[model samples]
Target: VTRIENLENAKKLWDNANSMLEKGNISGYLKAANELHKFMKEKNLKEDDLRPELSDKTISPKGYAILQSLWGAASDYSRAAATLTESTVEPGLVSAVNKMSAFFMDCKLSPNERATPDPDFKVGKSKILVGIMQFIKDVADPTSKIWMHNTKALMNHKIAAIQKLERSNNVNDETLESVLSSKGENLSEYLSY
Candidate 1:
């Protein structure tokens, strides 16, 4: 397909996923998300490739949601790390942590840096940031623990900011509660290693 064709296809898939999500069809949404990632991979497209216009500004809701689903499909390290033993390959663990951190960093850049950003977006983004920070804390060498602690402290500050946003927005919804609940599991799983 031509570049235009590829872009059109990606947009269609994104709409499909959004429609599925809006309908509360999570299974269909996840399936569409996986298909979207597969299409991007097959077309040699990165996240930025699909939305070049978003380069210098904040991301669109569609763009943000697409990347979030992609990352969800790409890594399940939180669950996997929970079962890791001392005999597990350190390199693999490091790689997973690094990949997840990169994803969070990418997401953190746009919506996170924007002034007066969406509180719901911040709530979601902070979950990833906090997870990355916790993973670093869990894996850092003893001498590096201080730096990791500082980093985690910064993430905690962000989380607090997000919490304030939620309260101010009156977003006492199930989605916020769900994300907040899983955050502890993400941290505990990594700390176990």
Candidate 2:
């Protein structure tokens, strides 16, 4: 897989990948085909604006706590992976990061889809236990055994669990309209941290 380093070779793989039929490297084929670049228009909205950009001040303490928890979870996983070898983890480290971020990915804390204006954020628990435990239990089966149903249930459970006292100055949030409005003047760069 690492042999082809040059773009000249990549195009060969790209055309070869696309021309082949059957299950012939389906993912590989698609990767090459779609990567064919474009006239990217980043005028009204820069690419970074589309992604989740949040920090300490705008959000509630609770939401910050939630992010810290998840960030710690991610950071710790990195630590453990560093100590061990990818061989010990079975699949490539690439897949580990790929699937792993998603499983615990903002498990409890994320934007509430239905919220008005800038949208709002929330976290989960017990049901939070449900999401974490679910991923832990399912990590073995090719990739997790159950993600769909559990996500559905966990969201409702946590959002419903959001009690009155939890409400405060948690302004941190993300959405299409709000993202642009928050940016104020510019959409900015794609390489922003």
Candidate 3:
């Protein structure tokens, strides 16, 4: 179909399309509608066509790698945000980081959530995952906005802590242990969230 640049032309074409539609030619109507949409898009008249963020390309391999690492870390962070006050949360976060880190080290990592089976692993990870799921449910409930806000605060605090670690020069193996253990005054308090 030819492009219709103006509303007058569009209306004329639409009228013609309606004539085709009356004869049961749905394809003509579709073509006309698509032309109208394209015209609107080209003229900057369609707001839906103004997406500036998403693109129709796959993320770069480097981006994918970063995503994998970020996701791995955020999975545990989500657990921390949700069930932090629970007794098992600290042990669970530590265990998840250790297990996932080991799997990464082995270079035998599988798909997410199926990467490793640790019979000797502690129950902490499962508890935290379950707690995060529960927290998700609560956040969906309209009445739980206060809880969601508090959880967000907890998440932000922990994220800041992790970012600090990312920028720190003193974060050797011992420092890493100290940070992840949720021990000491600063790191442990988010457990109340």
Candidate 4:
């Protein structure tokens, strides 16, 4: 009976975590991941018992693209966090970095790791990653600004490549416009520091 209850609880937490991920609620998703991890540890659940469906092959192309982008952003965030003054670090920023790192680690369960971005994920209309990069630039000292600028430029180049690819594709102008326009809201609102 105890084992059955534990299984049910684990399932509930796993579902909640995935739901939060789908909704683009990074903080909520991280919280759910931590909760699930704790529960699994406490219950001594086998790794095989919790098979999350985050495989690059299993998820939609768009989702896989998003995850790859998120991973890059997280890497940048971690580096920025490490460089920032301890007194200057905001709790929210810390939480964002923590969750992003945790999420990436959680997704690495498969034997075949997700591929790194070909160049990098398409910035498209989504400004979350760029916004975060800019925030790090804003907060850093002049010396660090050079590093941040280079990173920003790299990201910009990737975005330009994606734009060029989109233009070169055989898809009609109307269809391309519709698809680009429908990428949901600007992520800056949610991710801005």
Candidate 5:
């Protein structure tokens, strides 16, 4: 109930959130979260319930590589949003998502040369799909509901995984793997337990 964007582009938003972030790639990020969801759902596990504490290990180089690429994607989103603002695209993105869309932009768009664009997922070019997703959220009208919430939550979800704090976490557990996966395999095996 905090606030959500008007989602005239809800279909587009959801599609790309899956497609863009998961675009031209199958980095384990989506599959990882997907598995998390599967466990909670299949076991009827409660969010209130707890799990084993993750070791205080640092993120792996592979994780960093994925993070770097996502940051680059965030920049693309910001740029796309700006482009939408300048045009008549009926912006559907929530201001919150659009404003913070620059969260990782300067990190890459800065004066120095940046590194790490490999998808470890693969070396493919990250799509502007997320670029579309952000502006899509920002362009929404105020008198909106479900779609709005959908866009806002989705935007934040993507950001949450791509943040600095999480980036510092260990890549995996003794019996599990990090969020940065190289395939869609995690979408199931990681879920099926």
Candidate 6:
């Protein structure tokens, strides 16, 4: 009886987790992963008992692409933030740096960027980008551990590259057009399956 009850409870939790995943809530899914782990341990259930539909890959290809873009934006913002305070830079560089960070975060989870950017699952990509940029800006001071004269220059190059890509605009347009035409096909399948 206890085992049966545990099974039911586990299934319920699993279903809830699945629902959250489908809704594109990676954080919620992460939370559910933890819960499932605890439940499995407590119930002495094998991994298969959880009935996860995961393939050998943990992150779906779509998830990987979204995260990859997010990280790429972060890398760009890091450079912009560093260059904001550089002595040789233009007067408005600080504001430009701020904008760079803002846009990085905003674009990280853009409607077309996420595996599922549904309202509930919208990752705070913008906030994250800005936060990381702000951190880099703060830490690049001469007194800081990461201080280096060339750091800003290096960052400038990286940010410039990202800006170039954004200007290209191919990524946003192509991915969106393909996904929409596919009528709810998985992004990977929409692109190539």
Show pairs that collide, candidate 2: 58-172, 60-170, 125-128
- Top-scoring candidate (TM-score): 4
Stronger candidate by lDDT (3 vs 4): 4
Candidate 1 ranges beyond 4 A from true positions: 52-81, 84-193
lDDT against true structure, model 5: 0.33
lDDT, each prediction = 0.44, 0.29, 0.37, 0.46, 0.33, 0.41
* lDDT-better candidate, 5 vs 6: 6
Worst 10 residues of 5 by lDDT: 174-183
- Across 15-35, the per-residue lDDT of candidate 6 in tens digits comes to 555554455554454345446
Between which residue pairs do clashes occur in model 4?
Answer: none
TM-score of 2: 0.25
Candidate 5 residue lDDT tens string, 1-193: 1111212122223233234333334333433333444443454543223121112222334434544544444444444333311311222232333333232222123335243344455332223233334444444443332222343434433444334333575322211112111112222222110
- Give lDDT tens digits, candidate 2, residues 7-104: 33333433342342122332332233323221112123222222232222132344334433333333333333232212233122223433333322
lDDT of 2: 0.29
Off by over 4 Å in 4: 52-59, 84-109, 115-193
Ranking by TM-score: 4, 1, 6, 3, 5, 2
Q: Which residue pairs collide in model 1, if any? A: none
Task: Count backbone clashes in candidate 6.
Answer: 4
- How much does candidate 3 score in TM-score? 0.28
Give the per-residue lDDT digits (tens) of candidate 3, residues 65-166. 332343444355434434443434343433444343232222222234242222232223222333333333333323322222343344344445555765
Residue-wise C-alpha lDDT for candidate 4, range 28-141, written one tens digit per residue? 655666677778778987445655433332333443455555565555434433433221232234345445444434543554655443333343333444344334344333
Best-to-worst lDDT order: 4, 1, 6, 3, 5, 2
TM-scores, all models, native as reference: 0.37, 0.25, 0.28, 0.43, 0.28, 0.31
Question: Regarding TM-score, does 2 or 4 come out ahead?
Answer: 4
Q: Which stretches of candidate 3 lie over 4 Å from their true place?
A: 1-57, 75-149, 163-168, 172-193
